[PDB]
Amino acid sequence: LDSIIGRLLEVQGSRPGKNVQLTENEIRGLCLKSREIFLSQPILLELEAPLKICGDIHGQYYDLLRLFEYGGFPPESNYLFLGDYVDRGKQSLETICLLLAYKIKYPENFFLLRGNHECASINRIYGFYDECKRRYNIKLWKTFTDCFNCLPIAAIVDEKIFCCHGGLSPDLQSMEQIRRIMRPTDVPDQGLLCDLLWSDPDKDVQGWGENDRGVSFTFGAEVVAKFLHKHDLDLICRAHQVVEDGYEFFAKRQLVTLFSAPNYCGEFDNAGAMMSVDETLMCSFQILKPAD
Amino acid sequence: NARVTFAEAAEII
Ligand SMILES: [Mn+2]
């Protein structure tokens, strides 16, 4: 129904913090429907330009509306999201709902990837399960899990821009490896899938190194360079990490990092960004600053 | 046919 998406957009213009309390049936519907569409589409998305790409939102619902305000609400534009929708922020429930709605309404112009914070392992503890349990019930959180497990892992835009939440993997040799993993699936402790959602680029590291997070790896400019060449690609688009200005380059503009949730947590005191990728595969960046 | 390019200037929203 358009009723749920209407009610979600209704709090636009309101002072930041006002909730939107859907019925659990609506939300359940949103999960089950979008779940079916996720398994309808490939786990490795073959996408086309033009599209706008966003990074971590982490429940900051009113900042998401600002991004849509500028970028045009679907289907004014096409959208890829690089995961990490829930936790840390005040309104995870609204955020994931609005997105799934759009995914259901425009399944061919709106796309969602799995971020590391789309696991029962990490929704618990970091704030999402708490929100479900406070505003709804445990059973509803289990539903969300079962929906998150069907999320796409990576995407490729016009056979040139590789998009995923975390980054590269030492176990990644061919793309057909990404197409092999059957959904639904939980993110494992270690391996290809986990690396894709957890790994980081590192300036000081040479090759494959340890990660301060405690899971997966750090990688260096050499791996980025040789990966693009080996796969007929020009750029790696990823999120996962907090960077001021919203975006930050790695290697010689061979990997960009996108973070779309301003003043994350906070404090951190950062900014958010999104990539405008046009039909000529030209990328431009638009910055969001922390609101008054 | 098409290759990746970056607009040098960014803009504030
Ligand atoms: Mn992350």
Author numbering:
A (entry chain A): 9 to 300
B (entry chain C): 11 to 23
Original paper wording:
One of these interfaces, which occurs in about 90 % of all validated PIPs, is referred to as the RVxF-type PP1-binding motif (single-letter amino acid code, x=any amino acid), which binds to a site on PP1 that is remote from the active site. In conclusion, we have developed a cell-permeable peptide (PDP3) that competes with endogenous RVxF-containing PIPs for binding to PP1 in living cells, but does not bind the closely related phosphatase PP2A.
The corresponding RATA mutant of PDP2 (PDP2m), showed no effect in the deinhibition assays, confirming the importance of valine and phenylalanine in mediating the high-affinity binding of PDP2 to PP1. To understand in detail how PDP2 interacts with PP1, we solved the crystal structure of the PP1:PDP2 complex at a resoluion of 3.1 Å. The structure shows that PDP2 binds in the same groove of PP1 as other structurally characterized PIPs containing the RVxF motif. Hydrophobic contacts with PP1 Leu296 are also observed in the PP1:spinophilin complex. However, the position of the visible N-terminal residues of PDP2 suggests that these basic residues are located adjacent to a negatively charged region on the surface of PP1. The efficient cross-linking of PDP3 to PP1 can be explained from the PP1:PDP2 crystal structure, where Met290 of PP1 is in close proximity to Ala18 which, when replaced by Bpa, presumably results in the formation of a covalent bond between Bpa and the Met290 side chain.
